[PDB]
PDB file of C-alpha atoms in Angstrom:
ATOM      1  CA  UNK A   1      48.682 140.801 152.052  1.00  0.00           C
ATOM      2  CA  UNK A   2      51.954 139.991 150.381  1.00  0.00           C
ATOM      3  CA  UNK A   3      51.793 137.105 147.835  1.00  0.00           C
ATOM      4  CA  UNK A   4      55.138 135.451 147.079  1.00  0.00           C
ATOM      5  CA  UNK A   5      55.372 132.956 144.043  1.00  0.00           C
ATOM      6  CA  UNK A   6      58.145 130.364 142.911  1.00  0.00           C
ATOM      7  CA  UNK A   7      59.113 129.673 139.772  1.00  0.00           C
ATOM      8  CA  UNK A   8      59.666 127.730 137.452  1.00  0.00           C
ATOM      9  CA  UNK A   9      56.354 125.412 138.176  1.00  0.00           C
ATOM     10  CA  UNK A  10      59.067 121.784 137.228  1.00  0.00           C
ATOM     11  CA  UNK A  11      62.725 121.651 137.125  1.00  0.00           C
ATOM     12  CA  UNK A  12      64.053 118.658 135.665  1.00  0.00           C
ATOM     13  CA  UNK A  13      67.539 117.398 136.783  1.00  0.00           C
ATOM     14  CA  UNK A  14      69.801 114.436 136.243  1.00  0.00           C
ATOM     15  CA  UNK A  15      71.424 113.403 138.961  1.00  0.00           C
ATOM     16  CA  UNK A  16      74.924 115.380 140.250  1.00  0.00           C
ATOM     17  CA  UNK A  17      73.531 118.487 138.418  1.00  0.00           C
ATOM     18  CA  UNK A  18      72.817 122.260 139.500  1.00  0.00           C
ATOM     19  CA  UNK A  19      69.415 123.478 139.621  1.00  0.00           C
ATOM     20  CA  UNK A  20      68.012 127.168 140.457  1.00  0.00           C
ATOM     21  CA  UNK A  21      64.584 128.152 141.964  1.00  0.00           C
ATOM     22  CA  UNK A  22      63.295 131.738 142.057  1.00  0.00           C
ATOM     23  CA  UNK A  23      61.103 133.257 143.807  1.00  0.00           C
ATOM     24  CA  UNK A  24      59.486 136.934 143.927  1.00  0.00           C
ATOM     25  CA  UNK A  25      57.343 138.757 146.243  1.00  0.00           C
ATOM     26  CA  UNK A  26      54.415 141.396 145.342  1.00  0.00           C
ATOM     27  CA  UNK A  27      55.630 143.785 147.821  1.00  0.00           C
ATOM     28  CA  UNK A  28      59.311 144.023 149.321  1.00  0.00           C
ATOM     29  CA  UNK A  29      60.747 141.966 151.985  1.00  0.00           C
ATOM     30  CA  UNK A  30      63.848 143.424 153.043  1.00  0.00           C
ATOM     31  CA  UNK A  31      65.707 139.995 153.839  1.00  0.00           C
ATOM     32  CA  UNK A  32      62.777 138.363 156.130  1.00  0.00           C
ATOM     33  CA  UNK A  33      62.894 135.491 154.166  1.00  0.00           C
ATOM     34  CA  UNK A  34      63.376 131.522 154.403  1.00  0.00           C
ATOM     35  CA  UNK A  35      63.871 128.088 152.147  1.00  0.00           C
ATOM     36  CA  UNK A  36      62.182 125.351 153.699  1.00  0.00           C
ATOM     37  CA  UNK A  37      62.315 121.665 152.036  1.00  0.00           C
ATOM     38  CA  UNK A  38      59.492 119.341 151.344  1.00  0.00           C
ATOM     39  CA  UNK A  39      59.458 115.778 151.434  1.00  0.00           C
ATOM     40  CA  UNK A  40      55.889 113.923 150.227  1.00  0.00           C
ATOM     41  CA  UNK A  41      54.811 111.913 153.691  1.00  0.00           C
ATOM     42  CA  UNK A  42      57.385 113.459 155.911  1.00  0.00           C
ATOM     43  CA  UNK A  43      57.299 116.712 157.593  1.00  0.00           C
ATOM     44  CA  UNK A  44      58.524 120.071 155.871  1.00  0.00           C
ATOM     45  CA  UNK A  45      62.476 120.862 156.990  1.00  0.00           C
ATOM     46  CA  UNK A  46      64.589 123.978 157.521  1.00  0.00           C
ATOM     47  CA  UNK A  47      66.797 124.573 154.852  1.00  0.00           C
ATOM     48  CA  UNK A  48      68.311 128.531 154.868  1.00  0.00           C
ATOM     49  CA  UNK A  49      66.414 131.283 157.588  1.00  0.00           C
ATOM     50  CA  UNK A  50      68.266 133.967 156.620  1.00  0.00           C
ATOM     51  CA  UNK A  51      68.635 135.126 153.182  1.00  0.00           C
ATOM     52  CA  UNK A  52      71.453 133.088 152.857  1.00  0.00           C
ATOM     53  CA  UNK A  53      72.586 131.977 156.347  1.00  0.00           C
ATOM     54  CA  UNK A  54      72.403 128.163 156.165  1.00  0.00           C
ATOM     55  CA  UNK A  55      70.989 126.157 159.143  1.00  0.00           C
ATOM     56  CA  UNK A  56      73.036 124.100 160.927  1.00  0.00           C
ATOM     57  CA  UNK A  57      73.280 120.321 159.478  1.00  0.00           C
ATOM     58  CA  UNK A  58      72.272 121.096 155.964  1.00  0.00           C
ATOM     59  CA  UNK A  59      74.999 120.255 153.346  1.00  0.00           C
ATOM     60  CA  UNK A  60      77.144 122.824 151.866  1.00  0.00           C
ATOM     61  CA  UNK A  61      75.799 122.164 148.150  1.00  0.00           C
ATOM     62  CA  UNK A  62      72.613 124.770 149.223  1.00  0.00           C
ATOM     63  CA  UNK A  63      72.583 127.865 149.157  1.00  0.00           C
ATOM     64  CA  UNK A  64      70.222 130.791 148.575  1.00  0.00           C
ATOM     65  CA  UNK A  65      70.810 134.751 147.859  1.00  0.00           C
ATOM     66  CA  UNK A  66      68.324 137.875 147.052  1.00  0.00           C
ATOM     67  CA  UNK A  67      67.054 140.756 147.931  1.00  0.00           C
ATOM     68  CA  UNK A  68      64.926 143.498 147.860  1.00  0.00           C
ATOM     69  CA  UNK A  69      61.754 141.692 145.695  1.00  0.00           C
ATOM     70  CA  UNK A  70      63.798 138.918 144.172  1.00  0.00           C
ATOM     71  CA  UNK A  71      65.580 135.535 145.709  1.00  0.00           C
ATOM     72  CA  UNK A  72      67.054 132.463 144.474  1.00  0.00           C
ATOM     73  CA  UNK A  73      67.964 129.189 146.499  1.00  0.00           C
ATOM     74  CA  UNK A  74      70.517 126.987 144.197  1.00  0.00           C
ATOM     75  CA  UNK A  75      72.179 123.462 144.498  1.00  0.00           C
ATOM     76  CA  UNK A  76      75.763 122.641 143.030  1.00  0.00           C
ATOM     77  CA  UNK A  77      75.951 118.865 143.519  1.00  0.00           C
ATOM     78  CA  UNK A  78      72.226 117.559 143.635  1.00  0.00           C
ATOM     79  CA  UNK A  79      72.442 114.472 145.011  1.00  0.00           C
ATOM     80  CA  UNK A  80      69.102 111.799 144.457  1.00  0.00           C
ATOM     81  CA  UNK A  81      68.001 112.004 148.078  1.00  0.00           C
ATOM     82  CA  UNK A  82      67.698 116.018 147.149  1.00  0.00           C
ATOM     83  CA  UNK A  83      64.805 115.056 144.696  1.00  0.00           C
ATOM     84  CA  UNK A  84      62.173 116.540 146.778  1.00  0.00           C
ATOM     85  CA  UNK A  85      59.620 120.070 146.371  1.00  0.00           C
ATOM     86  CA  UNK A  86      60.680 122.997 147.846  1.00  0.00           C
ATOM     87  CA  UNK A  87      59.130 126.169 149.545  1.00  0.00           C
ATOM     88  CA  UNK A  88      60.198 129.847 149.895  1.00  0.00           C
ATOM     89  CA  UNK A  89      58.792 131.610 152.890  1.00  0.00           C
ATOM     90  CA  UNK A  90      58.560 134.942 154.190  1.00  0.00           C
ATOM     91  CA  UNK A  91      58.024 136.287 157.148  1.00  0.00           C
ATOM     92  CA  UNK A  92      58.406 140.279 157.081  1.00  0.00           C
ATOM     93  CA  UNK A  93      54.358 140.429 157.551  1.00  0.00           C
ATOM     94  CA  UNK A  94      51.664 138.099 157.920  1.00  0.00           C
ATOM     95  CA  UNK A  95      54.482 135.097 156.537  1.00  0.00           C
ATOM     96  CA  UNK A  96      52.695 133.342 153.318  1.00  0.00           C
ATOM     97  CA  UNK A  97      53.922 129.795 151.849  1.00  0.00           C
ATOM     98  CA  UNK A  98      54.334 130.153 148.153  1.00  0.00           C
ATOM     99  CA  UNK A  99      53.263 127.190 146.123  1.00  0.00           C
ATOM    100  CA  UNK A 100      56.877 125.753 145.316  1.00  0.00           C
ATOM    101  CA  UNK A 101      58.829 123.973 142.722  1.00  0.00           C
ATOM    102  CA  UNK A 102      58.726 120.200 142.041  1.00  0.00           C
ATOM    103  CA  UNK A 103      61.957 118.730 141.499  1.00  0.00           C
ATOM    104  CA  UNK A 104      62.148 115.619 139.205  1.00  0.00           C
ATOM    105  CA  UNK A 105      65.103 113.291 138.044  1.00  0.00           C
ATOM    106  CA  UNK A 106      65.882 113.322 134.583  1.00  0.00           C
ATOM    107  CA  UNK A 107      66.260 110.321 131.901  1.00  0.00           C
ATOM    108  CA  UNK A 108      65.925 108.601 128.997  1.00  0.00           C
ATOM    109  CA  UNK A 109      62.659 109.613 126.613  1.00  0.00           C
ATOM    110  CA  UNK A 110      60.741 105.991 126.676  1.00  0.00           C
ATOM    111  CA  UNK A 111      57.235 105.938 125.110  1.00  0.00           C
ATOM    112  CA  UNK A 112      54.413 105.057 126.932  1.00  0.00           C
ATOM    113  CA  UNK A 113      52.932 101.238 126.995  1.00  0.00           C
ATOM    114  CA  UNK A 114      49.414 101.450 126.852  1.00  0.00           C
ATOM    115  CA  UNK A 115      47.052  99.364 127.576  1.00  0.00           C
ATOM    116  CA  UNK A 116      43.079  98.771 128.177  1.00  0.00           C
ATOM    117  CA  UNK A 117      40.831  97.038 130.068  1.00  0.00           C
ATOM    118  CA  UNK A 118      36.733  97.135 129.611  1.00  0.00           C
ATOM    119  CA  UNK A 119      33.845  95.773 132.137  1.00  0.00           C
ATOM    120  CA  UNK A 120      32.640  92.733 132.662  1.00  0.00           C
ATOM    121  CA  UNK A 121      29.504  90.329 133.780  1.00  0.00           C
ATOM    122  CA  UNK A 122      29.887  90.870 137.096  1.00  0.00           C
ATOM    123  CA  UNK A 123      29.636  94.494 137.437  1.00  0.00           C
ATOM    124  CA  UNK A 124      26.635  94.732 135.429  1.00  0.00           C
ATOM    125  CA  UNK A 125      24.792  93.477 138.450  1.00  0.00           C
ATOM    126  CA  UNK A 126      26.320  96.125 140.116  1.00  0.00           C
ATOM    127  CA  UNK A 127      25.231  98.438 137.844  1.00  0.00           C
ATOM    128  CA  UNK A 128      28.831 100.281 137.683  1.00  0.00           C
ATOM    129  CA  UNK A 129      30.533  99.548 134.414  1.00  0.00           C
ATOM    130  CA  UNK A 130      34.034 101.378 134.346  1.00  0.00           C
ATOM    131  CA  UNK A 131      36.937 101.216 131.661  1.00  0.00           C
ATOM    132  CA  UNK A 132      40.807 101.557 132.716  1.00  0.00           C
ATOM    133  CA  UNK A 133      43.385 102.909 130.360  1.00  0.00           C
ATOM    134  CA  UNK A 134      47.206 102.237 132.233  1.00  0.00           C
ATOM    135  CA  UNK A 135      50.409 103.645 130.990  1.00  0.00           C
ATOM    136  CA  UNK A 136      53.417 101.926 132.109  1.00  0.00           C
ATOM    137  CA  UNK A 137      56.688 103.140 133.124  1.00  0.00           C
ATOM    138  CA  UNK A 138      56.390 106.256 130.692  1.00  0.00           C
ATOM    139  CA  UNK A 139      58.644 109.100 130.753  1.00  0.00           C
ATOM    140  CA  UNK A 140      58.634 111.978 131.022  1.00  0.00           C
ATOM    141  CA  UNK A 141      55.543 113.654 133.049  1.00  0.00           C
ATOM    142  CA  UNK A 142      54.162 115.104 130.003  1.00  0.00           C
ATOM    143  CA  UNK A 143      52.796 111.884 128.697  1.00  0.00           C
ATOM    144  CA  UNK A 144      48.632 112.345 128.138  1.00  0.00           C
ATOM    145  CA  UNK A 145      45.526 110.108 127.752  1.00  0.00           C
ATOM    146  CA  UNK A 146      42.486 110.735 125.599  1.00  0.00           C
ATOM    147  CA  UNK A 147      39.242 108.450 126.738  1.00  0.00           C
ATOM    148  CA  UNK A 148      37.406 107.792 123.439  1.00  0.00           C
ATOM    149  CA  UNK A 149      33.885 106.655 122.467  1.00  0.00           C
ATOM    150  CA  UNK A 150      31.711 107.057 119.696  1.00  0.00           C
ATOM    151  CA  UNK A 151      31.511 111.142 118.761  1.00  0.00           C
ATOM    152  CA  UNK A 152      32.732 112.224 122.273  1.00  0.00           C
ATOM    153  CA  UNK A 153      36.597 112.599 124.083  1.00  0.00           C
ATOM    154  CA  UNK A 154      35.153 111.437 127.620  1.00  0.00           C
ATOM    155  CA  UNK A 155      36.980 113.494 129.446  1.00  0.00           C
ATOM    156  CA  UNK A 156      35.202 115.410 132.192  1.00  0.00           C
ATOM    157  CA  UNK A 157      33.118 112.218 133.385  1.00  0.00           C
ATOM    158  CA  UNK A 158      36.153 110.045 134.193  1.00  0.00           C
ATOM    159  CA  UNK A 159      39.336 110.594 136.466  1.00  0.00           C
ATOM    160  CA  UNK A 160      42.997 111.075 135.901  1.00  0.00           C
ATOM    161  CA  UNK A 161      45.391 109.337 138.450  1.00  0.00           C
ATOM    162  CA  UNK A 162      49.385 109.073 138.780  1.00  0.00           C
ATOM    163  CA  UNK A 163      51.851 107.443 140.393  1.00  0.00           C
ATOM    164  CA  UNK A 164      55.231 109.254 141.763  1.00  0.00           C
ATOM    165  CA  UNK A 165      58.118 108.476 139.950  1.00  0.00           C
ATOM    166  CA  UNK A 166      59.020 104.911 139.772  1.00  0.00           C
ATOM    167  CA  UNK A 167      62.226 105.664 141.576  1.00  0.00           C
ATOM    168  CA  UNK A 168      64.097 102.482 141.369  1.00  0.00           C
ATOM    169  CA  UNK A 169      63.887 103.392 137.998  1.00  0.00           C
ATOM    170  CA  UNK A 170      62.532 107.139 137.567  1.00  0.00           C
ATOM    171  CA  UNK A 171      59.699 106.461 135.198  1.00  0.00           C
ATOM    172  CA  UNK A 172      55.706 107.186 135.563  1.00  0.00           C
ATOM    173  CA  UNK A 173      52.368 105.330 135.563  1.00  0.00           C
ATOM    174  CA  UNK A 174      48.858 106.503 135.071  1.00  0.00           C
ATOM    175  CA  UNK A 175      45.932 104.585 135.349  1.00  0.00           C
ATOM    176  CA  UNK A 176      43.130 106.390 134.327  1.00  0.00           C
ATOM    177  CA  UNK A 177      39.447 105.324 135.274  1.00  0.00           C
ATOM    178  CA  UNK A 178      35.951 105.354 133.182  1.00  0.00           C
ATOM    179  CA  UNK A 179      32.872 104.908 135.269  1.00  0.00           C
ATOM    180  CA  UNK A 180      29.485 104.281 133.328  1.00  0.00           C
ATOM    181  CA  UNK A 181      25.962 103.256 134.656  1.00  0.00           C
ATOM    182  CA  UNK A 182      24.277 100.266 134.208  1.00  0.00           C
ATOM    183  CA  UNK A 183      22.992 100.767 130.906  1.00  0.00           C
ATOM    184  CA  UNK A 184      25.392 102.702 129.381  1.00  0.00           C
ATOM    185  CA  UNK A 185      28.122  99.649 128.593  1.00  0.00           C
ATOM    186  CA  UNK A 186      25.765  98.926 125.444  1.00  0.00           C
ATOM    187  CA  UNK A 187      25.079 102.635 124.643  1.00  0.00           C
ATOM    188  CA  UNK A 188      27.995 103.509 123.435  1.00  0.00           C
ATOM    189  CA  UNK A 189      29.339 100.964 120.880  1.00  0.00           C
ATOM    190  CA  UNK A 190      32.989 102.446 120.515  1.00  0.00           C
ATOM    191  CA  UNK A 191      35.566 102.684 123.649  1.00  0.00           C
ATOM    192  CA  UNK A 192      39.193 103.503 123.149  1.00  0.00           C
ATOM    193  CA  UNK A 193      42.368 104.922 125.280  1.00  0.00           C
ATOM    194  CA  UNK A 194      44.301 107.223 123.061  1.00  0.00           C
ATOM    195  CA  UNK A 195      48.326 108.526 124.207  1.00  0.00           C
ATOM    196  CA  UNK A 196      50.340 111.296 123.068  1.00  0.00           C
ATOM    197  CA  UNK A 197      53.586 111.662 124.200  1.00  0.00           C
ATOM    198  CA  UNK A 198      56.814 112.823 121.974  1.00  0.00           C
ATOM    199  CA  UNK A 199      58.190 109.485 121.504  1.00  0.00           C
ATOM    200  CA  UNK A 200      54.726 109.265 120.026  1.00  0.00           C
ATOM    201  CA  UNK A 201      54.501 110.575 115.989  1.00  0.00           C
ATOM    202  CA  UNK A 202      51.071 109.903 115.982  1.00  0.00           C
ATOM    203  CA  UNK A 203      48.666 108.822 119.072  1.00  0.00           C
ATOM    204  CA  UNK A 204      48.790 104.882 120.104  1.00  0.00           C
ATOM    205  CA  UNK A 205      45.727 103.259 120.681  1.00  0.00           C
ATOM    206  CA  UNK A 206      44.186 100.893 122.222  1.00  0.00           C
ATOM    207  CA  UNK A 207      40.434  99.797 121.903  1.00  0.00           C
ATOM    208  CA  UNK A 208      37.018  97.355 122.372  1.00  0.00           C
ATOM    209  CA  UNK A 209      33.742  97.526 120.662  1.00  0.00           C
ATOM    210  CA  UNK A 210      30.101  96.209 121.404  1.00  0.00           C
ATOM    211  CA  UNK A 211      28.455  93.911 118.710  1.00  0.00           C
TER     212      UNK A 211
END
């Protein structure tokens, strides 16, 4: 019955900084609640049971505190093995999972590098003529791709995909994928990949043509 929600969605945070996560609950739950730590691949870890009580092992820079409807799980001295997604929990009912906070590091604004990449012979055969935009190393997460052909933003008949963070440096990369039929390649005479991003003024391009 009881939903429970974390906010804010993204918290972005350089590295040795503090960072705050809320999280609410539709009905009241007294103190029944948990902070449990999520690392992609691994297995989800114990962070605070209690309200605040922290679990034995976990470093002193956590802590959590609430009440009531309201509670809020903090770190002092983020470290960059901290970069992870995080869960509150509650357990004074049926326990829920709410859908947790991402946790990002933060860095320099760098544009995205954009390229593009039509078919060729060989897939014609095939039938299966696809189109890749790739953005390179851009940051941060907000960067965006626009497939382009003649009168029509193909979006909605082609796929978005993204890397995590490049951590060794902390930036992203998309590679985003056109599929066509057989006969469409020559159809459509126009094909671009078009990027916004707010190192962006205006939208970078990148494009191929039939003739």
């Amino acid at each position: 019955e009881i939903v429970m929600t974390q906010s804010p969605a993204t918290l972005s945070v350089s590295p040795g900084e503090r960072a705050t996560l809320s999280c609410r609950a539709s009905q009241s739950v007294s103190s029944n609640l948990a902070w449990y730590q999520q690392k992609p691949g691994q297995a989800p870890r114990l962070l605070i049971y209690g309200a605040s009580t922290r679990a034995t092992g976990i470093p002193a820079r956590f802590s959590g505190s609430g009440s009531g409807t309201e509670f809020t799980l903090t770190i002092s001295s983020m470290q960059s093995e901290d970069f992870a997604v995080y869960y509150c929990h509650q357990y004074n009912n049926w326990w829920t999972f709410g859908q947790g906070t991402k946790v990002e590091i933060k860095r320099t604004v760098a544009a995205p590098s954009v390229f593009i990449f039509p078919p060729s012979d060989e897939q014609l055969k095939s039938g299966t003529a696809s189109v890749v935009c790739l953005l390179n190393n851009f940051y941060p997460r907000e960067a965006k791709v626009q497939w382009k052909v003649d009168n029509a933003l193909q979006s909605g008949n082609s796929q978005e995909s993204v890397t995590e963070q490049d951590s060794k440096d902390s930036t992203y990369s998309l590679s985003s994928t056109l599929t066509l039929s057989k006969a469409d390649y020559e159809k459509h005479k126009v094909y671009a990949c078009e990027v916004t991003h707010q190192g962006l003024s205006s939208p970078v391009t990148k494009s191929f043509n039939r003739g």
